[PDB]
Design a protein around this motif. Structure first.
Motif, PDB file in Angstrom:
ATOM      1  N   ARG A 192      79.688  18.916   1.017  1.00  0.00           N
ATOM      2  CA  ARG A 192      79.737  19.052  -0.338  1.00  0.00           C
ATOM      3  C   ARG A 192      80.831  17.952  -0.790  1.00  0.00           C
ATOM      4  O   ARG A 192      81.647  17.467  -0.200  1.00  0.00           O
ATOM      5  CB  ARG A 192      80.490  20.386  -0.490  1.00  0.00           C
ATOM      6  CG  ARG A 192      81.845  20.357  -0.238  1.00  0.00           C
ATOM      7  CD  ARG A 192      82.316  22.042  -0.250  1.00  0.00           C
ATOM      8  NE  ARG A 192      83.687  22.078   0.124  1.00  0.00           N
ATOM      9  CZ  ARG A 192      84.217  22.087   1.210  1.00  0.00           C
ATOM     10  NH1 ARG A 192      83.415  22.003   2.520  1.00  0.00           N
ATOM     11  NH2 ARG A 192      85.467  22.144   1.532  1.00  0.00           N
TER      12      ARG A 192
ATOM     13  N   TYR B  27      73.629  30.786   1.780  1.00  0.00           N
ATOM     14  CA  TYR B  27      73.778  29.457   1.710  1.00  0.00           C
ATOM     15  C   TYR B  27      74.898  28.946   2.259  1.00  0.00           C
ATOM     16  O   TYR B  27      75.934  29.858   2.399  1.00  0.00           O
ATOM     17  CB  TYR B  27      73.245  29.125   0.340  1.00  0.00           C
ATOM     18  CG  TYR B  27      74.167  29.409  -0.884  1.00  0.00           C
ATOM     19  CD1 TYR B  27      75.376  28.326  -0.968  1.00  0.00           C
ATOM     20  CD2 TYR B  27      73.996  30.134  -1.848  1.00  0.00           C
ATOM     21  CE1 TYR B  27      76.040  28.476  -1.992  1.00  0.00           C
ATOM     22  CE2 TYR B  27      74.759  29.999  -3.103  1.00  0.00           C
ATOM     23  CZ  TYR B  27      75.910  29.106  -3.132  1.00  0.00           C
ATOM     24  OH  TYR B  27      76.787  29.159  -4.296  1.00  0.00           O
ATOM     25  N   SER B  28      74.867  27.771   2.252  1.00  0.00           N
ATOM     26  CA  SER B  28      76.335  27.169   3.055  1.00  0.00           C
ATOM     27  C   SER B  28      76.662  27.887   4.065  1.00  0.00           C
ATOM     28  O   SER B  28      77.623  28.046   4.369  1.00  0.00           O
ATOM     29  CB  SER B  28      77.401  26.620   1.982  1.00  0.00           C
ATOM     30  OG  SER B  28      76.743  26.157   0.950  1.00  0.00           O
TER      31      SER B  28
ATOM     32  N   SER C  80      79.209  24.099   4.039  1.00  0.00           N
ATOM     33  CA  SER C  80      78.920  22.839   3.320  1.00  0.00           C
ATOM     34  C   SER C  80      79.970  21.653   3.747  1.00  0.00           C
ATOM     35  O   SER C  80      80.432  21.173   2.763  1.00  0.00           O
ATOM     36  CB  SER C  80      78.866  23.094   1.895  1.00  0.00           C
ATOM     37  OG  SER C  80      78.130  22.138   1.174  1.00  0.00           O
TER      38      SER C  80
ATOM     39  N   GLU D   3      76.564  31.988  -1.414  1.00  0.00           N
ATOM     40  CA  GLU D   3      77.157  31.438  -0.287  1.00  0.00           C
ATOM     41  C   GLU D   3      77.754  32.623   0.787  1.00  0.00           C
ATOM     42  O   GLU D   3      78.238  33.734   0.429  1.00  0.00           O
ATOM     43  CB  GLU D   3      78.821  31.132  -1.089  1.00  0.00           C
ATOM     44  CG  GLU D   3      79.286  30.138  -0.047  1.00  0.00           C
ATOM     45  CD  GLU D   3      80.485  29.393  -0.757  1.00  0.00           C
ATOM     46  OE1 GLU D   3      80.455  29.050  -1.728  1.00  0.00           O
ATOM     47  OE2 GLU D   3      81.653  28.974   0.140  1.00  0.00           O
TER      48      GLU D   3
ATOM     49  N   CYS E  56      81.502  26.668  -3.155  1.00  0.00           N
ATOM     50  CA  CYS E  56      80.607  26.165  -4.023  1.00  0.00           C
ATOM     51  C   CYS E  56      80.741  26.908  -5.552  1.00  0.00           C
ATOM     52  O   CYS E  56      80.328  27.992  -5.635  1.00  0.00           O
ATOM     53  CB  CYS E  56      79.157  26.342  -3.803  1.00  0.00           C
ATOM     54  SG  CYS E  56      77.904  25.771  -4.614  1.00  0.00           S
TER      55      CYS E  56
END
Ligand SMILES: NC(=O)c1ccc[n+]([C@@H]2O[C@H](COP(=O)([O-])OP(=O)(O)OC[C@H]3O[C@@H](n4cnc5c(N)ncnc54)[C@H](OP(=O)(O)O)[C@@H]3O)[C@@H](O)[C@H]2O)c1
Ligand SMILES: O=C(O)Cc1ccccc1-c1ccc(-c2cccc([N+](=O)[O-])c2)o1
Length: 316
Positions: free
Chosen positions: A218, A210-211, A215, A186, A299
């Motif tokens: 989510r 990522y994200s 996100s 993340e 996350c």
């Protein structure tokens, strides 16, 4: 800004890819088709996303249409936690290959460092809601991943959500045959990850962010949560460059020598998100974006916080 980054297996990885977590199965085939049509050559997948068949339909159609050659695509998937047992790794990879309709993956990641009990359930629980761990040593999982390279199923292997001590454990594995090529973590302006990124980069491991938009879809998002896309400071940087906030959020990791994998199923946004190779954030812009770090991690799961390999107790 070159379009690809060189991995420690000798292959080149596109620095921009399409994320597919939460992309509904009735929308993701067209999303991936659009992405390939507008220039994406890297798709981030996972068995646990429950949509690899539908992603695969899109990939196969674009290969059949000769829009793109297989060698020009960079397809990533991930070994889920319930398949860490050394004897289950190959079958898990084969199921992903079958669903994606491919004969190899460009990159296969250990999705999380936490192994879980094997079975139908992605999160096997005890009666009190704790995830039920596996006893499998991750170094054994890594050896099983190495076999996939040697058997031709995957061109590269890597890790995801590994903290620096966990990365170090792999790097220090007795008899290590292939180093991790990538650690996918993340990363965005509210969780800038300087320490872990510098560690990985110093070891020649490429980091994927990522994200990168935080996100916002989510499932556990709360109305009062911080919002990168709505941060007025980031909006102002975007306005200066005549770009959108999302475009700034995507360009940011690119300039840190990261790969980045924004998710969208909206055709206009898929195209928008790719139009990030025509502007440059200044180093002052970059440092300003870095300054927004609040160690805000989106996350992670409560059910896993007592697993011995939970990655986020460590500082980095
Ligand atoms: N390795 C891991 O453990 C792990 C964990 C999390 C994520 N990932 C990977 O990283 C990918 C990206 O992360 P993510 O899915 O968590 O979130 P993200 O890419 O940060 O954000 C996705 C959200 O942003 C919206 N969006 C996208 N582009 C936009 C734009 N230009 N303007 C406004 N809104 C926009 C999307 O909406 P629409 O789709 O409705 O357009 C969606 O709601 C995942 O899909 C997955 O492939 C990996
Ligand atoms: O993993 C993904 O790419 C996103 C995701 C998709 C589908 C189901 C679960 C997911 C997460 C989200 C977090 C998560 C965890 C999975 C295993 C362990 C931990 N943890 O916090 O230690 C978290 O697993």
């Amino acid at each position: 800004m070159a379009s690809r980054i060189l991995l420690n297996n000798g292959a080149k990885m596109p620095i921009l890819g399409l994320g597919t977590w939460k992309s509904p199965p009735g929308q993701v085939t067209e999303a991936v088709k659009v992405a390939i049509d507008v220039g994406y050559r890297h798709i981030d997948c996972a068995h646990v996303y429950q949509n690899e068949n539908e992603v695969g339909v899109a990939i196969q159609e674009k290969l059949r249409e000769q829009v793109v050659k297989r060698e020009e695509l960079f397809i990533v998937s991930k070994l889920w936690c319930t398949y860490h047992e050394k004897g289950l790794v190959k079958g898990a990879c084969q199921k992903t290959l079958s669903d994606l309709k491919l004969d190899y993956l460009d990159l296969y990641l250990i999705h999380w460092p936490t192994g879980f009990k094997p079975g139908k359930e992605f999160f096997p629980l005890d009666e009190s809601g704790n995830v039920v761990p596996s006893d499998t040593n991750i170094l054994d999982t890594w050896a099983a991943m190495e076999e996939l390279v040697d058997e031709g199923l995957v061109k590269a292997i890597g890790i995801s959500n590994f903290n620096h001590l966990q990365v170090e454990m792999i790097l220090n594995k007795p008899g290590l045959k292939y180093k991790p090529a990538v650690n996918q973590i993340e990363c965005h302006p509210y969780l800038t990850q300087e320490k872990l990124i510098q560690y990985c980069q110093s070891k020649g491991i490429v980091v994927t962010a990522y994200s990168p938009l935080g996100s916002p879809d989510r499932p556990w998002a709360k109305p009062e949560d911080p919002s990168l896309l709505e941060d007025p400071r980031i909006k102002a940087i975007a306005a200066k460059h005549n770009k959108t906030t999302a475009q700034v959020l995507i360009r940011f990791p690119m300039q840190r020598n990261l790969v980045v994998i924004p998710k969208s199923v909206t055709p206009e946004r898929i195209a928008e998100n790719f139009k990030v190779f025509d502007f440059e954030l200044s180093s002052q812009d970059m440092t300003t974006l870095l300054s927004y770090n609040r160690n805000w991690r989106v996350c992670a799961l409560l059910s896993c916080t007592s697993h011995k390999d939970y990655p986020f107790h460590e500082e980095f």
